[PDB]
Amino acid sequence: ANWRERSDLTVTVGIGNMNKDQQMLHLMRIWEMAQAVVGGGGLGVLVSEQ
C-alpha cells in the first residue's frame, strides 16, 4: 500500500539515534543502570534476561 506517509526522523539530531549519542549514552548510563538493576534492583521482576 502506498500509504502516502513516510518518515526519515531517525537519521540526525532529531529522533535520530545517531552513533555518537548511542555509544556514549548506552555504554555509560544504560550499563550503569543495568548493573544496578542486576545487583540489587532485581532479576525476575525488573528488566530481565528476556
Binding site: 506517509e5 518518515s7 526519515d8 526522523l9 537519521v11 539515534n17 545517531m18
Partner: protein, 50 residues
C-alpha cells in the same frame, strides 16, 4: 585580483568546505540502514515497515 609580476594566491576557502561535507555526511548517510524508519502501524510492523 591576480596580475603578472605579483602574488596571485587564492585561498581554497570552499574546497576545504566541500571536502568536509564529503566524508562526514557521506559516512553518516551510509551508516548501516538507519536512513529510513516508516513509523509503522501497531497491527503490522514487520511485514510492511522493516
Amino acid at each position: 585580483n591576480e596580475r603578472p609580476g605579483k602574488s596571485g594566491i587564492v585561498s581554497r576557502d570552499v574546497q576545504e568546505t566541500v571536502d568536509w561535507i564529503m566524508p562526514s555526511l557521506m559516512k553518516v548517510f551510509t551508516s548501516g540502514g538507519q536512513v529510513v524508519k516508516y513509523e509503522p502501524d501497531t497491527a503490522e510492523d514487520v511485514e510492511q515497515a522493516e
